[PDB]
Design a protein around this nucleic acid. Structure first.
Lengths: 143, 102, 50, 53, 85, 133, 118
RNA sequence: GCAGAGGCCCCGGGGGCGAAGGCGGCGCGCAGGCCCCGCCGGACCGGCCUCUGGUGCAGAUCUCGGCAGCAGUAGCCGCUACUCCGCGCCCCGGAGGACUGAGGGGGAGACGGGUUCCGCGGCGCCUGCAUCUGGCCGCGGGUGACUCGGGCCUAAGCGGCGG
RNA sequence: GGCGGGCCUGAGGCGGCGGGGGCGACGGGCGGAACUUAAGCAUAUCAGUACGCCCCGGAGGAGAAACCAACCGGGAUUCCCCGCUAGCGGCGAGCGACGCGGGAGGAGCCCGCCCCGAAGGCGCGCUGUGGGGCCGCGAGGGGGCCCGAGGGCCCCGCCCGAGAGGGUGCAAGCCCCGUACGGCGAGUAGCGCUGCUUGAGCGUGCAGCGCGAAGGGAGGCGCGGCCCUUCCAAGGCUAAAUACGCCCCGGGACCGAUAGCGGACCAAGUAGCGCGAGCGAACGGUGAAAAGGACGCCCUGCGGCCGCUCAAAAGACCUGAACCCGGCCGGCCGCCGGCCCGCCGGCCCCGUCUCGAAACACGGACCGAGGAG
RNA sequence: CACGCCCCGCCGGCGGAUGCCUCGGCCCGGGCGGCGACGAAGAGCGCGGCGGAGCGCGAGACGCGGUGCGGACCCGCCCGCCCCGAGAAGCACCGAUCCUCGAACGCAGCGCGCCCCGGCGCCGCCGCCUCGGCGCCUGC
């Protein structure tokens, strides 16, 4: 006994019966191999196209992290006026669109409008050899 | 709905409306769909009923009444512990991961 | 049970038929060298259908 | 392992030892008894993986 | 007369062979099979004993129309599938 | 080594293969080195033993040369003519000594007709390997 | 017997061989009861032979009926494509991918373009 | 000391010129234990370093398997009982003597057993001694219905029922 | 009064087309314990657990805000890492989210309402259809010495994109198979009162009954008044990343026949036992090959004796421990010490509980295996 | 004296320990996700020249037919192939058969029908045909 800080553990539940609540991670190497092949098959399905898509630059939520920026669900319609594109066109060029997102600042529109402009400048669009030698983006676009 | 679904297992249950009520008994009018009629299978809007995942919507509480009892209709704080399912959310929270690299 | 039902008669019949020792040729064909059957039933020794 | 048996202790006054006894009177479900569940079974939960910085 | 004498008066047959399972468990008086589950559509598969389920289930016997159709999925019934669809 | 994963290196998986093999796989297992002359004529290193193939057994026990009189696929053994165990009596059932095909050298083989077509099949297939597969 | 010959015989003729083959089996069986056989070869072969005649008889009438109810839908149950219980009900790709007509106009408005980021 | 793993054993550790185990007998170590020898055995086995562990028994009215001494001991007394001569076995036939004693140890059925029925052979088992005997074993057989019973009808009952 | 024609509710029958039941898992919806823990025990706890019940599917459920937050903000779902806190609780024992952050993965939409109104999926429908994988080739080893047999030693070599392995009569890259190597939105929201649940606390989610709106919901302390920030409930669809048996494939620093599945055995859910629900054993190894026992000599017959086959009887089967027993040969014999060795001296039955055991305290007939931080 | 012990050393019994093995387990990852009225899962009977178990089948029964390999056997006797095609073992893959019960389907389970031999279950959906109603009307 003596000066032991009190245990905060929870007594084991359904140990030998009912729900299987022990889920050992013995497949961690295996899962990583499975995900890699699936990602590689997706990349092959559109060789010129990137596996992932351009995501908006958003300020991290809450005061503790509200001075750095993280990738988010999509660009708002006001941020799409900056690149002059409709929502459907944005999907065609790989821009994900969050129509729900509201910029909440005029400054927010500008960092996003710049990000949208770069994708449109960097992208090359093809509707034979060029597609074969295109080289797709590997990684999150412009992290 | 569950009583109608048992009486006709061949038919699929959509939603149910309310028709009348008396102090002794309430009368709810269910709307059911025949999943095999060529019209239904050859109609884009309702084709989702003939998917076999949607068999017995009412036995598995996947209707609106089910979504009210499970509380799925409430969203946000207060349903956080019932979204994947009432049972699954408890299961995910109460699991010893025992991650390998640990 | 001198009076019997046909269904009862044919399940008892199979038992009488299958109370047979392993054929000698089979014993030496498979080189089994273990004649017994072991599913053989003695009428007095065992109570079938119980 | 060894748990796939129905054994309940016979109880004192029958002369035999009080350990789980199968219907036959055959010892069962004991760390020592033939066919019994091991005293503490080996389990995958053991951390086969140490960690190095 | 509790033991030996009473057993002498057992000249009858409480249980008999049942159509669905073939085990000696159809009680003639109540026309029900304790292990087969006859006469209700659903069989008596109770979870309390797994030792009971592991005795008669799926795979414990013939499995004709199962093995044959599984084999054809491991061969060409999937080709017909696109044809039908 | 065994780069292909499917092949099994457990002794029990490998030995179950040897003891429970079907006949077509049993025959390939039951093969012997063709003689220097036969190897040159057909360009095939080893071929399956047949009911009447002359064989020279280098096995230390019961060695010698004789035609095959029978092949027992079940025990993977081949009974040869002229090679037998010592007989307790001057006249007795000739009891053959079973020899694994590995020991035999096929000095001459039953040509058959299928076996000239099969021997040409190997030579066509062997040719591809010689020119870089 | 050899199946190739059985296709050759006329359909009425095949039955005639079957009737003789059926009697040939009975007479063989009567001999077994009398025996107080020598791996009776005919008995084993004849038993397979009634099947052989029936199989060719069956192929004749199975293909004939399948052909007769060909153009027709509502085909006899056996000759209908076998599939499985699951496949029988499951909707075809062209019933599953049937989009509401309005979506089909908008879908075409912004079609897939291959793009590569530099 | 035990059991596996990653090394090592300076021409690549010891092995059918006999491995592990068995059995006696030495020497060593305070002791756990070790070592050699001979014989039985017949193909695997270690030393040293590091590593993991389902790792050391005299006991738990311990489990499970063998099994002693009691001990040629207790015991083979339900229903009167067999003997003689036929090889004479308790079997069979002949002759005596008796018993069950007509609510029969008699002739048969319902039920329960489910081939136990029969002819022939044989005692390997069993016949709680014996057997040449048989309910045992092998080997072949064996039950035939318009008129007897089921089926049928309803009784107590129990299913069915738009619901 | 009667009798037709439509419309509308309802009958019988036919045709086609579906439903049912099966899975020891995973997933949904339910009905739902108790031992246990609180060193007692009522709330609590086990546990939103077993079990009962009904459902699907290869996944399932979930899911495109009546969302979080309070910021120099995010922005469907699911799963992961993280904080295991905020809280709750005979504030006892215990219990217990989420939002952030870093990741896997990313996909959005439809109806009603509403405008047109058979333009339709037209024997219906204007109570509203319609539009807006297999197949294969596949390298290279000779003598000597010796053994029942080299896959043994001893000299020498050969092939390796193959020295993973298995087989073969002894330890085989080179004897065989292989292996490396190829190819072909209303009875609702709400409110009241009860029950049920949650960590949710003047209430997390639900339900019964009563009563029931219009701009209405939320912002984690209630109740009114005033603002703000944020969303549209009472209708639906939707891939992905997530789970898991039977089933098949590989690897095990796994167990090696009282072990490991109950079940390594030609016939294990079997032989059996129980009216039944149910319970459920035991049993692997001759050798290199059956060569599975020649010749005899015998015998009332059995059965023996020499031997035979065999490296070996290994002979109903490998090794063959202890207990215990029989022949033979020897002694008078427990332990410990001394001495040639049958004499002296010492020596109560161990383990255990206990102040106290040789105890007329208890467990142990023997012996082998299994047996507990 | 025997017996009984200890056996100084020697053979032989009963037993199955030990040591080695080894087509079996257990655990881990993969892959799969493939049942049913076109009768499932299960069960019951029957089927082998000599055939009891198990497996496999279904009166076409220890299989039959077609297709490609494959290439000489067939676990006992026997009979059967042997052959540059003639074709045993083996292997996939399609075509059929499929007896009673079983979700179990003319009604009971072991026996009874009724109809034209097609047959004959039930709950659905949607047509269709034949119909009732002092529902609502409209004529007569």
């Amino acid at each position: 006994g003596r000066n032991v800080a009190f245990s905060n553990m929870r007594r084991y539940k359904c140990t030998n019966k009912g729900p299987n609540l022990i889920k050992n991670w013995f497949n961690q190497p295996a899962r990583k191999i499975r995900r890699r092949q699936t990602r590689l098959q997706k990349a092959k399905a559109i060789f010129p196209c990137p596996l992932q898509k351009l995501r908006p630059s958003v300020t991290r939520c809450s005061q503790k992290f509200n001075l750095t920026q993280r990738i988010g669900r999509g660009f708002t319609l006001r941020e799409l006026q900056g690149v002059g594109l409709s929502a459907g066109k944005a999907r065609q060029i790989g821009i994900a669109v969050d129509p729900r997102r509201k910029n909440k600042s005029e400054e927010s529109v500008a960092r996003n409008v710049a990000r949208l402009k770069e994708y449109l400048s960097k992208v090359t669009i093809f509707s034979p050899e060029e597609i074969q030698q295109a080289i797709q983006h590997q990684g999150v676009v412009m992290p | 709905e569950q009583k109608v679904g048992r009486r006709l297992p061949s038919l699929r249950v959509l939603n149910s409306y309310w028709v009348a009520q008396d102090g002794s008994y309430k009368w709810y009018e269910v709307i059911l769909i025949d999943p095999f009629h060529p019209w239904i299978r050859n109609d884009p809007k309702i084709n989702w009923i003939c998917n076999p995942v949607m068999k017995r919507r009412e036995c598995r509480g996947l209707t609106s009444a089910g979504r009210k009892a499970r509380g799925l209709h409430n969203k946000g704080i207060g349903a956080m512990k019932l979204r994947p399912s009432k049972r699954a959310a408890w299961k995910r929270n109460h699991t010893r991961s025992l991650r390998r690299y640990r | 049970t001198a009076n019997k039902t046909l269904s009862r008669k044919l399940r008892l019949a199979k038992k009488t038929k299958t109370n047979k020792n392993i054929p000698r040729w089979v014993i030496a064909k498979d080189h089994l060298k273990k004649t017994w059957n072991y599913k053989r039933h003695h009428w007095r020794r065992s109570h079938l259908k119980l | 392992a060894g748990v796939q048996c129905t054994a309940h202790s016979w109880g004192p006054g029958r002369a035999v030892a009080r350990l789980p006894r199968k219907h036959g009177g055959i010892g069962a479900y004991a760390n020592f008894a033939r066919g019994g569940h091991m005293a503490h079974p080996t389990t995958v939960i053991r951390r086969w993986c140490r960690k190095v910085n | 007369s509790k033991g030996t004498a009473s057993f002498g008066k057992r000249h009858t047959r409480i249980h008999g062979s049942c159509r669905r399972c073939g085990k000696h468990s159809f009680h003639l008086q109540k026309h029900e099979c304790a292990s087969c589950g006859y006469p209700s559509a659903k069989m008596r598969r109770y979870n309390w004993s797994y030792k009971s389920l592991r005795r008669r289930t799926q795979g414990t016997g013939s499995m004709s129309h199962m093995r044959k159709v599984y084999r054809a999925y491991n061969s060409g019934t999937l080709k017909a599938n696109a044809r039908k669809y | 080594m065994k780069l292909n994963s499917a092949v099994t290196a457990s002794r029990r998986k490998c030995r179950k293969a040897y003891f429970t093999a079907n006949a077509e796989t049993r025959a390939k297992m039951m093969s012997s080195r063709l003689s220097k002359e036969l190897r040159a004529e057909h360009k095939i290193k080893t071929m399956p033993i047949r009911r009447g193939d002359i064989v020279e057994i280098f096995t230390g026990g019961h060695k010698g040369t004789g035609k095959v009189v029978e092949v027992r696929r079940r025990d993977y053994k081949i009974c040869v003519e002229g090679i037998n165990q010592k007989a307790r009596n001057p006249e007795a059932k000739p009891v053959p000594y079973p020899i694994h095909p590995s020991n035999c050298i096929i000095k001459e083989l039953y040509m058959n007709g299928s076996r000239y077509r099969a021997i040409k099949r190997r030579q066509e297939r062997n040719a591809e390997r010689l020119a870089r597969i | 017997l050899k199946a190739k010959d059985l296709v050759g015989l006329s359909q009425e003729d095949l039955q005639r061989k079957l009737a003789d083959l059926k009697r040939e089996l009975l007479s063989l069986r009567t001999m077994k009861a009398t025996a107080g056989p020598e791996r009776i070869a005919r008995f084993r072969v004849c038993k397979k032979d009634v099947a052989r005649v029936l199989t060719v008889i069956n192929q004749k009438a199975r293909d004939e009926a399948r052909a007769a109810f060909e153009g027709a839908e509502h085909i006899p149950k056996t000759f209908r494509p076998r599939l499985t219980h699951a496949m029988r009900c499951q909707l075809t790709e062209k019933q599953k991918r049937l989009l509401p007509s309005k979506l089909m106009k908008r879908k075409l408005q912004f079609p897939k373009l291959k793009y590569a980021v530099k």
